[PDB]
Design an enzyme around this catalytic site. Structure first.
Site, PDB file in Angstrom:
ATOM      1  CD  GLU A   1      -2.686   1.806   0.560  1.00  7.69           C
ATOM      2  OE1 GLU A   1      -3.371   0.963   0.034  1.00  7.69           O
ATOM      3  OE2 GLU A   1      -2.734   2.955   0.486  1.00  7.69           O
TER       4      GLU A   1
ATOM      5  N   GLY B   1      -6.967   1.148   4.819  1.00  5.46           N
ATOM      6  CA  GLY B   1      -8.401   0.601   4.710  1.00  5.46           C
ATOM      7  C   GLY B   1      -8.896   1.055   3.083  1.00  5.46           C
ATOM      8  N   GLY B   2      -8.206   1.435   2.451  1.00  2.00           N
ATOM      9  CA  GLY B   2      -8.673   1.693   0.820  1.00  2.00           C
ATOM     10  C   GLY B   2      -9.060   3.195   0.869  1.00  2.00           C
ATOM     11  CB  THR B   3     -10.565   5.117  -2.070  1.00  4.50           C
ATOM     12  OG1 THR B   3     -11.267   6.424  -2.197  1.00  4.50           O
ATOM     13  CG2 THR B   3     -11.468   3.728  -2.604  1.00  4.50           C
TER      14      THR B   3
ATOM     15  CG  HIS C   1     -47.026   0.330  12.284  1.00  3.09           C
ATOM     16  ND1 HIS C   1     -47.491   0.982  10.900  1.00  3.09           N
ATOM     17  CD2 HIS C   1     -47.455   1.457  13.011  1.00  3.09           C
ATOM     18  CE1 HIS C   1     -48.181   1.965  11.164  1.00  3.09           C
ATOM     19  NE2 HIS C   1     -48.080   2.121  12.591  1.00  3.09           N
TER      20      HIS C   1
ATOM     21  CB  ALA D   1      -0.707   8.613   6.417  1.00  2.00           C
ATOM     22  CG  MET D   2      -4.574   8.734   4.376  1.00  2.11           C
ATOM     23  SD  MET D   2      -5.974   9.579   3.892  1.00  2.11           S
ATOM     24  CE  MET D   2      -5.459  11.509   3.883  1.00  2.11           C
TER      25      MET D   2
END
Ligand SMILES: Cc1cc2nc3c(=O)[nH]c(=O)nc-3n(C[C@H](O)[C@H](O)[C@H](O)COP(=O)(O)OP(=O)(O)OC[C@H]3O[C@@H](n4cnc5c(N)ncnc54)[C@H](O)[C@@H]3O)c2cc1C
Ligand SMILES: Cc1cc2nc3c(=O)[nH]c(=O)nc-3n(C[C@H](O)[C@H](O)[C@H](O)COP(=O)(O)OP(=O)(O)OC[C@H]3O[C@@H](n4cnc5c(N)ncnc54)[C@H](O)[C@@H]3O)c2cc1C
Ligand SMILES: [Cl-]
Lengths: 435, 441
Positions: A30, A37-39, A420, A34-35
């Site tokens: 990856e 988990g993916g986009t 309901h 720093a980011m």
């Protein structure tokens, strides 16, 4: 490493953990150290819908930006722990190149080898060739707009796609004038006859300005404001978002060195089972070029998993009735065919709608806008589509999709006992109009 | 007046739906309602609508009086809407006044401006339930005592609320006024809190209530209700309690004593419920009973299913019955709501079947972090021999929508893997059912 996953994408995130528990020795790579988990976690739906929820509530925009930050930070650390706590997985950090069909160059530098390789590099925003988009203050894409320090007074949108509508409604509830600019003649041209008009009236009542047939030729910054020129005409806004659309990100990998073919816009062409030209390399998610969603990516993982660990095979051509949702307020959720699509075939149909003023649950939540439209095929009593524009329509359409996929007739939702009060029980009324 | 082909006693759900259905077919319909403030029925004026509207405002921490005012205009809109859905068709006579039976055919409608008498080829009982007042001295005399009705019309929020009893309706008001910013004290007269749900579920929901300052005092049956010093005083075997307002939440039983069904042949039981068929007939011919009067489940959707049964018999598509019911779902609209369908884990462990219990904490639902409510649990029970599911316990925001996905798979008998492999919508509450049934091993 028998399995090497390029990218922290949804399909790859799920593929890596699954293979480690099956005895495989996996390495996911990856670039954004720093980011994680993916986009979806950092840039995509999670940060977008976290602010969308804050917008409907009419909360301070800046404090809501901080609440996204703690939310994104909370889920980013967890997504990294799901892959690091597993023993047989190493989350190497850095961008990746292809050296060979079985070898990878990743950035001081590393030479990681692999028998199987799985690409989840995803897509990225493609900004059009507009003079001034390069160097102009106040111009932001989906990523950069989410980190806005201040709330603009006038936000302009360059695009009329579903992503542009989400931000248009998002900032309207925050308190900013919004101007949508799409070069089309029809607002939401892939939507129904009257659904797009209903969405239009909902947006325009919140100050949104839908400008159709717009053409943009220059972008500058004249006196504290962004300028959008349209042949002897100028639009002054405090911030400009580009909603151009995303196309696969397979250029920094050098796919040529691994004999992986890509199409005209960069999408690695794949088999019905996500096989590429290289025999031992797969591609799941946005790099395929299919529907650009988080569940299509996860379903790509289910296809590669049924091959590696499963008996027989399932492909991409069993994916029927794929639903989608435009998370404006109130959200539009669609599945199946439209009214224009239903009549396009030689099968007579029935289409009646239900107003949202007739759903008592809509008055309970203080939002009575939108329409509930469904299509039923009288020749087999089966449903061929539904367009639900109301509160919690994203939850609702799952019932409508599950019944279609099972092939059941419309008469089930007409007579089924729902809870309901709810929005899903509106289908009791919605399908009682079918004769 | 002339004989009516069908008369309905009560503006309830089944009765109001039947009146517009029979008049559409050309029947001579008469719906008798005893109060102008009850047009549309209990659900519109006293039940779901005015309670759910305040829960929505409570979860947003709106001002109390601002929410009460918003609640009133919602019921006043829908009430006027429900009066005109029926009083606008030429084949419907919306008659006001209390209805009293004289015969199998005739009916006395008590109008204070002169009594009237209405006859009917078919009669349909649908008078619902009235709140039960437990036999305890000091309840009808102390001024700070409220039913579920009188508490929804409060002037401004009290600082301390006392709920007499547990039950779903009790816990419903416990999370609402607490979220409104008020200490709530639920005084259930039992050994266990929510005794007909699982312990793991009940503990999680007691922790969600206690963190908002709601203490659950159990094993407590009150003796005397007083008004010592500007507060309602509740006396028990241990420490006595004081509240700015006391809410009775003991249940509702069918209203039938005012109908006098003995004069028509209709039978009642000890609690006062009309004895009914599987097709909702009573011991009298051409007389039916629909809704909570039948002693059945007191839900609006069951009352509307009652309509489906009598509509099938009358307007004719063969016949269906109450035997058709299975896996009836229900929700307890607190924050977060508790939605249930199927069996509990106790009855599962008791059945002796080959069983798997799966649990996914809500903190693992990314949509819950988006909605800023990570509390609650997700539990399900599958059968290892048949791959079907026995029950589900979903404690999360918007669980009243996901419980319908679960109930649709169970009534079709499809295996659990239907919900495991399913392309949902992202981000949503229902997509976390993908990860709940992936936990089966
Ligand atoms: C603003 C916005 C809103 C959205 N809203 C929704 C929505 O409501 N619903 C929905 O279903 N979808 C939505 N999406 C789309 C969704 O985010 C993606 O389609 C989904 O995450 C699919 O991801 P993927 O599997 O293709 O992999 P991705 O998650 O796209 O993979 C990208 C990851 O790979 C890394 N990477 C990229 N190139 C390389 C490389 N060469 N080497 C190493 N790592 C690399 C990136 O750093 C990143 O971490 C939205 C997207 C955006 C931008
Ligand atoms: C606080 C509360 C919360 C609730 N929450 C829910 C919920 O979340 N979900 C759900 O499904 N249900 C809920 N209910 C139950 C639901 O509101 C009702 O039980 C449902 O509408 C059943 O009513 P019914 O059809 O039997 O007729 P009802 O509407 O109960 O009663 C019919 C009408 O008959 C009238 N009547 C009575 N006696 C006579 C007479 N002698 N002559 C003429 N007319 C007469 C009354 O005015 C009454 O309004 C709740 C109830 C309460 C009290
Ligand atoms: Cl049941």
């Amino acid at each position: 490493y028998q399995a090497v996953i390029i990218g922290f994408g949804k399909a790859g995130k799920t593929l890596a953990v699954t293979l480690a528990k099956a005895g495989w020795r996996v390495a996911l790579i990856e670039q954004s150290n720093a980011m994680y988990g993916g986009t979806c976690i950092n840039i995509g739906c999670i940060p977008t819908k976290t602010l969308v929820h804050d917008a409907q509530q009419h909360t301070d925009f800046v404090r809501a930006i901080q609440r996204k930050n703690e939310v994104v930070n909370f889920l980013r650390n967890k997504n990294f722990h799901n892959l690091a706590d597993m023993p047989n997985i190493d989350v190497i950090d850095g961008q990746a190149e292809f050296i060979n069909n079985h070898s990878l160059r990743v950035h001081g530098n590393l030479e990681i080898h692999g028998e199987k390789i799985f690409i989840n590099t995803g897509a990225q925003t493609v900004v059009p060739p507009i003079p001034g988009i390069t160097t102009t203050p106040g111009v932001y894409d989906s990523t950069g707009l989410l980190n806005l320090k201040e709330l603009p007074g006038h936000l302009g949108i360059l695009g009329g796609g579903y992503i542009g509508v989400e931000f248009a409604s998002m900032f309207a509830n925050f308190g900013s004038k919004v101007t949508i600019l799409e070069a089309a003649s029809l607002f939401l041209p892939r939507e129904d006859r009257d659904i797009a008009d209903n969405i239009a009236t909902i947006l325009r009542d919140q100050g949104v300005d839908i400008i159709l047939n717009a053409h943009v030729e220059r972008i500058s910054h004249h006196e504290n404001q962004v300028q959008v020129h349209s042949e002897h005409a100028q639009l002054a806004v405090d911030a400009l978002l580009i909603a151009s659309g995303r196309q696969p990100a397979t250029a920094s990998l050098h796919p040529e060195n691994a004999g992986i073919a890509v199409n005209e816009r960069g999408a690695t062409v794949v088999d019905k089972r996500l096989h590429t030209t290289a025999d031992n390399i797969w591609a799941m998610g946005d790099v395929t070029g299919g529907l650009q969603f988080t569940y299509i990516s996860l379903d790509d993982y289910r296809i590669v998993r049924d091959e590696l660990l499963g008996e027989g095979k399932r492909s991409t051509d069993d994916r029927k009735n794929v639903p989608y949702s435009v998370f404006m307020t109130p959200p539009l959720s669609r599945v199946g065919m439209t009214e224009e699509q239903a009549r396009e075939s030689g099968a007579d149909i029935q289409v009646v709608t239900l107003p949202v003023a007739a759903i008592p649950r809509a008055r309970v939540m203080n939002d009575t806008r939108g329409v509930l439209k469904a299509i039923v095929d009288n020749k087999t009593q089966r449903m061929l589509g539904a367009s639900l524009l109301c509160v919690d329509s994203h939850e609702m359409i799952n019932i409508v999709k599950m019944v279609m996929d099972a092939g059941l007739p419309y008469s089930i939702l007409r007579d089924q006992i729902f809870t309901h009060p709810s929005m899903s029980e509106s289908l009791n009324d919605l399908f009682s109009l079918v004769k």
